[model samples]
Target chain A: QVQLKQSGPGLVQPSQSLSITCTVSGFSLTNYGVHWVRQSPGKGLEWLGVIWSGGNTDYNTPFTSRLSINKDNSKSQVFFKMNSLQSNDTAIYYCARALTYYDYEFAYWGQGTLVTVSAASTKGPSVFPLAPSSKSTSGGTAALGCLVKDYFPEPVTVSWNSGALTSGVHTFPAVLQSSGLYSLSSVVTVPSSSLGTQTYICNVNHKPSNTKVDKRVEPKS
Target chain B: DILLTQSPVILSVSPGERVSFSCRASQSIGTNIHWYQQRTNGSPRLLIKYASESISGIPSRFSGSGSGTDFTLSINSVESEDIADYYCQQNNNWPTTFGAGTKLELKRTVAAPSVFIFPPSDEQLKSGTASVVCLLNNFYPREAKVQWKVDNALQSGNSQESVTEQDSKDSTYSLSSTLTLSKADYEKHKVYACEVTHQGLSSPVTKSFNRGA
Candidate 1:
């Protein structure tokens, strides 16, 4: 039951520095190394850096210049100092344990902590308030593309629900909008016969909002 | 950057199929090539290292061999949970590089890809704007990735990805991502593949497509 409890400043202004800490339990820091990873909204996982047991550090190419990795073996802790913080730098930061030996990957992860930069200064992620349904262009199939947008520091999830018989559904990955925000659009195609029979729904999940977006449409039966 | 290439971009197999995959390096990487399994959502897990040497706690079913510029990772009758993306990293260089990655998947039997191309139209097509989308859906275990090629050469970009939708009644997973190319290139007879790999697969299961395919 190895656990990496992480804590850090959630709010920071743009173009400054931000720091965080990882407190470990059920494992010895002297035996294992700790790593820092971040998820910018709309982007996938990015490995920032790692603090090995011997104080040896490795930083990913993007962060090597602006990031510094540190640790305290006896204190059972690891520290991170990421410099020149910007809006894009705002993300849900996580700490993970990288085992000893010629190992790679962070097997154990901490529950992510959201670090925000504020509006104007704030970068973020979230769910779709409106989802529209209709006929798909592929013919014989009726579908709709639910535009899920306006979340920051993303990597959100999208889903579908309907009494209409769906033959298939495709959810596109969230894209970073021009507003420096995020948008995820997904489409669901159903059997044409059942298209107008039942109301279908799209659910957008942006966890931190403690919010779930479900938009539905009543068909003209 | 130390260049790394993985063969058999996609592998799909039954629950107990023996499998073997290869990783090649541009220069001699010695025995420093390490293998990691990266499942969707879950963090990657280390599987093997130093070519043939064993690592503590890793299952014996997972093994490695061959060194220098070429290396291989083998599995004996891969288990269902052994499905995921396998990547080999060469640490013998200043800017360490990793193989493009080989995907492993679990299916009842071998299934050739059923492709759906979202063909570009009008300006989107004429302007060489190749946003060709190849979709793989209802793939069980959802542990596969799509590889691309443009004008017969391996295409690498921010073009590959995976989608997850657990918001349904069936926990058995289904997801898909796209592979990209320029419209003019795809308009010709040049080839690229949508290879599907799995731990249960003895080799890659590919469906090569072009404009006429």
Candidate 2:
């Protein structure tokens, strides 16, 4: 069980740039890559971007142009930067680790720090870790848990569709485990009409890499 | 950065009753919608999404409705097992948003007094001391606070503790609360209550219990 800890200001001003850090412990950057995720005041979890194990990165389709992920393996830390902030960006941000592309699902996450994008600072939205992609039966109800570890005030999302499911139920900020790890899960049920014929997906988007790992499951019937 | 809201913070449902939860977005969500369930000290579980789509293995009693800006999550014939917190989310834009939450509680519509009796334990007989533990399960918004009250009076000096939880699917959480009572209080048959509080709600929920005979 690796642990990722995140740190940053809780407040951010709209239209300003936002930067946060995800610090990792009990794990090596060389072994696992770091990513970023975010959740608005009361909303689903969003993938911001990621810094891959190979030092490469990727971002959410909507955030690619404005987001960047960088890392310092020696320091075992990753940084997230987003320019042109807005109130919509206000959220708790976090960092997490994934072993590889196949294991793209986030295994460890950092406690999130609330970052509010207000008129004053122009800071960007908060960020967290990405979730594992999932596939399920079209009509079968699937419960996909998006565990955002180490991020207190944890918020998560679950979606289902032929494409990535983005909108779903989420949890309010909850305390982390006594061990200092924070987590939350999101569930999405597949409709019977969409079963077997559609692709049911679950994605955990984290900050830094804003990495998204998707899973697709087919309905049994 | 879309904003989401859910109305009727506390929803009371009787066994076999039907319930619905709504999630309204400040902006158009463009058909992105998801729903989940959170039990006390447990992680959130996916329920329904995208205007009625079902997740694999979820029961049929659970369903979703609406799309884009306004979405509804409905549970048919609510069961005692369905007592928990529910929320909605949207993925149409960056900085996704979620509904505050709609808690489905067991409606004590009947006039019968809700009983709260604790089971007698070995510690009570051996040490001449009795202790009562109240477990709050399947509640959400992990920040929920639980306080103990005895005989309608708030009890003091009770120990409170919690643990991080992970569901069968690996979602992480820490939503459980525990309270301990001394033998004297247990002997008095004090009615212990666990009160929970959170944001976006008008009042806290107080669950009650009584010491064993």
Candidate 3:
């Protein structure tokens, strides 16, 4: 049962201009083809642009001109506009389904829609917790480095130690520097078989002002 | 960002033969390249895009071409479900790389399996329990293993199996098993067999179920 439900607007305001909406079902938009794929935040996947099923549309290569993929198929839905938005465009959109139009593959997906970009004067994120740059490639392991800089509605949630952690963390995605504000980095690997008696922390949650920045590191000798 | 390289990493081919694979890239990047298959547990599809187009129903024998820094991906025949792995991505630039895969595999010879046996279900012997069903049809590499006898001896308690399904269109593979007995052990067990053991089948493949015939 192929589905693809996706909605947008988790928050946006940069240059303004971003739409989303996927709404699909078991199949048929004339016969399949829906595409869109963002990632941003911590960045990686990016495709953005498609709407075939005969409706025809295609975009990529930095979104051919700011992007534009549409559809309605009497309401099977599928739309995703894009235009001059910034802050690296935040990210996390998705609308998959391209099982026919010859088959571009993407069995079915669309459970994402993070879109967060609102920085024109709303900063809150500055924590610099650095210390173990090279001490745990393998040896009770220890590699902590959290240097989140000026931020502003991008995304920030690094936790460690104070949260007992859930894996040797590793973040890095808010980059957008030049004074406009935004710069992130996170790293936490504490496998202490007893390294420096232990004492590590690096929590920085900048949720629109309800800030929280903690940084502690201990391992002398 | 660039560097792809997918060539002959593994290939083997034989189901119907007519393969072709390659995906260079390192420079040109013109057509951009795409193609994907993955299979095996299934997930990575997108058969061809940009570097050859085709993608709606996907099988004009599979096909795809090249442009810029090489690209291929033919198929023309290969089936047994096309085995699978073939990757080759390259979003033209910006971080989107993948292509160290090729694999395809499946040298051929091993398409045995066609065992059926269903008896016992007149409403489950008038509700006294009794259930039997063993079907194995058209298999190949889907692994197989069933067993449940009675007259020849080795029968177990309640038995039940199923998990080799695949045949959306000749991918071949289907399995089913159920044993249950109790209508007085199904008439004191007069037969009831169903032993399939396959690895491309060199032997085993029994099927009986004559509880009242």
Give the candidate number with the greatest TM-score. Answer: 1
DockQ of each: 0.08, 0.03, 0.02
Model 3 ranges with Cα > 4 A deviation: A1-221, B1-34, B38-44, B52-64, B67-71, B74-82, B85-105, B108-175, B179-187, B190-192, B197-213
Model 3 Cα lDDT, one tens digit per residue, A26-106 = 888888778887655322345666778888886767778988888889899988989889878887787887545644445
For each candidate in turn, the TM-score is 0.53, 0.38, 0.28
TM-score of chain B in each prediction? 0.54, 0.55, 0.34
In order, what lDDT does every prediction score? 0.62, 0.55, 0.68
> Across residues A103-178, which tens digit of lDDT does each residue of candidate 2 receive?
3334356767667664432211122211111222222433223223334222333344433454433333333445
lDDT computed for candidate 1: 0.62
- How should the candidates be ordered by lDDT, best one leading? 3, 1, 2
What docking grade does candidate 3 earn? incorrect
Chain A TM-score, cand. 1: 0.54
- The CAPRI category of model 2 is incorrect
Residue pairs in clash, model 3: A40-A43, A101-B56, A102-B55, A102-B56, A103-B55, A103-B56, A104-B46, A105-B46
- Give the local distance difference test score of model 2: 0.55
Give model 3's clash tally.
8
